Amino acid sequence: IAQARKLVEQLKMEANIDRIKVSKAAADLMAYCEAHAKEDPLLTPENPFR
Amino acid sequence: LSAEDKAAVERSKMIDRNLREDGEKAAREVKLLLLGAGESGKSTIVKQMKITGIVETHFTFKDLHFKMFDVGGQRSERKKWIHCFEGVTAIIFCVALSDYDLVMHESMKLFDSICNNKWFTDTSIILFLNKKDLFEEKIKKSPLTICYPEYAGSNTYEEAAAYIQCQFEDLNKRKDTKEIYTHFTCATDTKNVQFVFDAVTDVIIKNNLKDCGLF
Amino acid sequence: VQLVESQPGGSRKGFAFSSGMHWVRPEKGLEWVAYISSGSGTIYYADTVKGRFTISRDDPKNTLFLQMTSLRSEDMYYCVRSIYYYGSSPFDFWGQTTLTVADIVMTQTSSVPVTPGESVSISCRSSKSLLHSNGNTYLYWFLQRPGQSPQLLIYRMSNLASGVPDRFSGSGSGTAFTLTISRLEAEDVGVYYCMQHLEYPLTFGATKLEL
Amino acid sequence: VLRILPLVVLGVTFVLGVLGNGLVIWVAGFRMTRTVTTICYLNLALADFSFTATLPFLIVSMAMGEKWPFGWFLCKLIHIVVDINLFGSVFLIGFIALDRCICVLHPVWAQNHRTVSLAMKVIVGPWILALVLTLPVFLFLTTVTIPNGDTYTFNFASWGGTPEERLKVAITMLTARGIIRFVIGFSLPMSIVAICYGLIAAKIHKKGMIKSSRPLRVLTAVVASFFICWFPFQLVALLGTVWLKEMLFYGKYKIIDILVNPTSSLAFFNSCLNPMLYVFVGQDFRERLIHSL
Amino acid sequence: DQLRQEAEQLKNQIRDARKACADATLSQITNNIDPVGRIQMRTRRTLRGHLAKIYAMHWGTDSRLLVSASQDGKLIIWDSYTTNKVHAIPLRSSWVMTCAYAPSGNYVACGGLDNICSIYNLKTREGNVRVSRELAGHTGYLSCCRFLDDNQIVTSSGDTTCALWDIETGQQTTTFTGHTGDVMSLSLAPDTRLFVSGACDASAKLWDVREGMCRQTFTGHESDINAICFFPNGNAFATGSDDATCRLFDLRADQELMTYSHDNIICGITSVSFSKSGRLLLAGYDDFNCNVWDALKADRAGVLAGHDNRVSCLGVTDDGMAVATGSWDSFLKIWN
Ligand SMILES: CCCCCCCCCCCCC/C=C/[C@@H](O)[C@H](CO)NC(=O)CCCCCCCCCCCCCCCCC
């Protein structure tokens, strides 16, 4: 059925990607967490529900 | 402590009163599911009561407001929305006795899942048997052994009906906190709504007694 | 969207109606008189006429009655609606009607001339503060063209309203309040007003801005 | 010899009574969703809790032998609260029985016309009846000091005039109190309880529906509890009311009095027994308590 | 034909490229991190008024208005600060799965087993609330609705297709159909250019609105997938399944970055959300408790344990200064 053809085409497109190493992504996530930690009162407790 | 917040609080209290009134009106009603295998005569069942997606029907009888939800359009995995009806009073389940020409045991499998499902451990099941006239006419020629090999009995209306009823009943596993109400009906009956009424009032009495701690 | 208002010592008397609705007050200034709270829950009257002027509403009838009696010499009047909740715009719609016979004060300045295009600004003076503890400050502006009706141009001195061209603005600090229009047009002439809404007696203002 | 038994019974009703009644007041109105059943349980719990709070002073009075070691206003308050709460408890037992009978006998009308609002409005009837029945004690209870030894009842020589008329008024008031007690606080409630519970048992037997011995056991427990717990006290009260004359002008019968107090202790045991039997039986109530603490 | 043989070759080749990507581990990456501590919160504003099971909630962009849908058929807009109600919306269908709130705070979306999405209008010249547009076109029940802006909405249905709609014209503009299970949740990108949605097929897919075609898939679960939400950096998302576990996914690496589990937990996961800093992966399970987990330290610590029934939904204020979770108990609990 053409469903198999569509699945094969989608898998070919998914193969066409060029991913990256997880080291860079983990470094980016760590940088994000470190940078945005100041404005997160759920970590460091003006409050609106006194 | 308030300038326009006085108006805010009254708005809140007025709509809270409206909510309580609407909730009492909702709690006044009784809720029933409606399941089947598709070929089952749920259309004839709903036609018997006088008057895309989920379709709901209202009817009253001897001063009792009935709401019935008919699913069957959803061709999806049932387990994800079967928990929405976790507080209905009863469940109406229909199978066709003229089940010797399908592509049967499928509806029994459907019954097994619904009668042991964890959401309905204490919810009664109303088992409607449909097409009794066609069943008699067909069984006058076709053999009961075509579907059931282990069966051993006469090729008679009453014997076949009793056997099918027994095989449906013994699928129940929690008969201590459960009840199956069985009924034989057709396209020309009129007491099916009264049977539903008797079953529902029994379930209502049972629930009230279980609240009162005497049962 | 539609609110048309219809012998001394004598006496005399759309849209979604079921949800405040106030009354307001002769070649002179304009001020508050009396009001309702929606649902007939809480009712306040005028401290200056308390006793002889009556108010009444009938939601199924969809009307409004103001039974005034024992006319003193201190006597136009108009009807106004205010659907009140968080983020709402009360007083947002006024109407038209004259009957000829220890609190806050809101004193504006008499007048000032301007030319079209030239920026114009207005100020006002209050008695006490208006920054309630909840977080916002209550004061409403009202342009009023001659032979016309006052409009809720700005409420809470920061928020515009429907139909308002966004060349207006507002601001306040304690008692000092302001109002600015960038490009005065052919339809920006008439007296102003004001109203404080913290202590429920609503002291209004006196500015006949001639061209 | 005999005096030890009444006090021992009331001591158990104090420690255990406030325990069970405190538990239900916490779960029925604070940690569960509000229904008619839980509002009725809450009211019964409140009446029983207030009575158990009033018990210890009466324990002291019974021990010291009919004399307040406490004050006048305090004595009046304690007696008014104990009377209001006993009558409220009995009337609430009757109301609960009536509600259960209504639910089991007319399931349709129950689901059409019983809501928390109507229940809240109608629950105040028995309280008002208890207040209007307790009037006498407010109108005619006073602390009279015996000239002999102590400040020990009703005497009301207030509108006395001639002592001959005062005695007639006293006899009339006492007889009225006794007869109204027997007619209202015991005849009506137990008649309602018996009739309603018998009717529901008859229905539950006629329409099948019986699985185990739990329903019959609990129903007979409630009816037998009420009877075996309240009957002796009301019987001795009626005998005293009808023999007042010969007990005053002659004191012919003293057994009655030696009996008045232990029967009262047995009657007060009912307040502690009530929550454990009406509320603790519920599976959902027990599960809610277990999860809460 | 021979496409399945080719499909096996491609599917096998998929796993090969996946293997070579993991140049390191999250343990190596997070070797220099201070653990957060046994974080605990308390209920401080309890909203009440619902009479049945609550299913979904969503904070507005004002960080002040939240809308919740229950089975009573009522859509209540609460003023969170004063716990007073602003509007109450009667629904045509009493079966609701999801609700949404417009970024401009002027529109509200509802949907359920009636498999119709309805937009409700709040800010009107008239006082009351009327229905603006109804969205027909799905065959299965709607599970999640979200707004792009005032003119666009994305829906997910049991038909195993996701759609995007123009409100003014009221017709679909894009169908997303590469999936094979039963879609349960949607989460929009912080820049609203792409979105992700898991399903019962135990696979997560990320799509692209402009081209309307899938571009990523993942294979990391043994049962149905219940909820998804974007990491606030727009380069990751998290998956909560029926199998008592959560796993994080990084898009530029296309692998399971981390997992979070335990032995005591055996119930499933109903909803998942992140905080502003992205440190806390808040999720509500089915065992009557809402756990708090750190998606990097990989040790759930926070036991949000106030509710009496199963936790169904949870959201986080856009300023990241509270957290609200509704449960089947018919209450809304806001933590801060
Ligand atoms: C309502 C349901 C439950 C209610 C809870 C409590 C009710 C239980 C019993 C009902 C009322 C009984 C109260 C206590 C009574 C006993 O004390 C005794 C028994 O009758 N009372 C008297 O004898 C009555 C007379 C007391 C004797 C003292 C003398 C006062 C009058 C006698 C006249 C002679 C002296 C005149 C004045 C004496 C003072 C100087």
Question: What is the secondary structure of C73-121 as a DSSP string?
Answer: S----EE-B---STT--TT-B------------EE--------TTS-EE
Give all chains having 3 or more CB-to-CB distances under 8 Å with chain B: C, D, E
Q: Cβ of A9 under 8 Å from any chain E Cβ?
A: no
CATH of the domain at E59: 2.130.10.10
CA distance C171 to C175: 11
Answer yes or no: is C109 within a domain.
Answer: yes
Looking at the structure of chain B, the number of domains it has is 1
Is C79 found in the same domain as C7?
yes
Contact, E42 vs E303, CB < 8 A? no
Distance CA(B95)–CA(B129), nearest Å, equals 6
Determine the distance in angstroms separating the CA of E53 from the nearest CA of chain B, rounded to an integer.
9
Q: Give the distance from residue B90's alpha carbon to the nearest chain E alpha carbon, in angstroms.
A: 18
Fill in the amino acid letter for E10: L
**Could you tell me which of C80, C65, C75, C81 has the C-alpha nearest to residue C98?**
C75
Q: What pairs with residue D230 in β-bridges?
A: none
Q: Are residues C70 and C133 in the same domain?
A: no
Q: How many domains does chain C have?
A: 2
Q: Testing the interface with C: which of E61, E63, E86, E122 to mutate, by most C Cβ within 10 A?
A: E86
Q: What are chain A's domains? A: 1-46 (4.10.260.10)
Q: Residues with Cβ < 8 Å from D243, sequence gap 6 or more? A: D252, D253, D256
| Chain centroid, CA A37 distance in Å | 18
Domain range for residue C111? 103-206
Task: Using alpha carbons, select from C87, E67, C46, C140 the residue that is nearest to residue B5.
Answer: C87
- Whether residue C37 sits in one domain with residue C66: yes
Q: Is residue E85 a contact partner of residue B55, using CB atoms and an 8 Å limit?
A: no
Name residue B91's beta-bridge partners.
Answer: B33, B125
CA D131/CA D125 separation, integer angstroms: 10
Please work out whether the CB of residue D148 comes within 6 Å of at least one atom of ligand 1: no
A-chain residues near E234 (CB < 8 A): none
Return the number of other C-beta atoms located less than 10 Å from residue B207's C-beta.
17
Which candidate, B2, B6, B11, places its Cα nearest to that of C132? B2
Which has the closest alpha carbon to E230: E183, E194, E260?
A: E194
Which residue is closest to E46 within chain A, CA to CA?
A: A49
Domain end: C38, C71, C101, which one? C101
Last residue of some domain: C101, C136, C151?
C101
User: For the sheet containing E255-260, what is the strand order?
Assistant: E225-230, E236-241, E246-250, E255-260
**Best residue of E276, E294, E323 to probe chain A, by most A CBs closer than 10 Å:** E276
CATH of the domain at B35: 3.40.50.300
Q: Dihedral of the CA atoms D42, D48, D51, D186 (nearest 10)?
A: 120
d(CA D68, CA E5): 101
- Using the beta-carbon criterion (under 8 Å), do A11 and E11 form an inter-chain contact? yes
Please name the amino acid found at residue B158. Answer: E
- Which helix H or strand E contains E324, and what residues bound it? strand E323-327
- Sequence positions preceding breaks in chain E, C–N over 2.5 Å: none
Which residue, by CA, sits nearest to atom 24 of ligand 1?
D153
> DSSP string of A2-47?
HHHHHHHHHHHHHHH-----HHHHHHHHHHHHHHTTTT-TTT----
Q: Residues of B forming the annotated binding site for Mg(2+)?
A: 43
Cα–Cα distance, E238 to E258 (Å, whole number): 9
Alpha carbon distances (Å) from D116 to B24, B206, D36, D275, E132 = 9, 20, 5, 21, 37
CA D248 to ligand 1 center in whole angstroms: 11
Domain residues for the domain of B171 are 1-215
Dihedral angle of Cα E265, E270, E273, E278, to the nearest 10 degrees:
30
Q: Is residue C211 in some structural domain? A: no
User: Is C touching D (3+ C-beta pairs, cut-off 8 A)?
Assistant: no
Binding residues of B: 39-44, 70-74, 130-133, 187
Reduced to 3 states (helix: H, G, I; strand: E, B; else coil), residue E206 is strand
Ligand 1 pocket test, pick from D140, D153, D156, D257 with the greatest ligand atom count within 8 Å of Cβ, gives D153
Identify the chains in contact with E, defined as 3+ C-beta pairs within 8 A: A, B, C
The verdict on a CB contact (< 8 Å) between E115 and B52 is yes
Distance between Cα D85 and ligand 1 center (Å): 20
Residues C60 and C155 in one domain: no
Work out how many domains chain E is built from and give that number: 1
Residues C125 and C94 in one domain: no
Residue B205, classed as helix, strand or coil, is: helix
Same domain, C133 and C180: yes
Structural domain ending residue among the three candidates C82, C101, C120 = C101
Q: Decide: helix, strand or coil at residue C5.
A: coil
Resolution, rounded to a tenth of an Å?
3.2
- Clarify whether residues C53 and C117 are in a common domain: no
**Which residues sit opposite E332 in a β-bridge?**
E47, E326
Q: Is residue C59 part of a domain?
A: yes
Residue nearest ligand 1's atom 11 by CA: D153
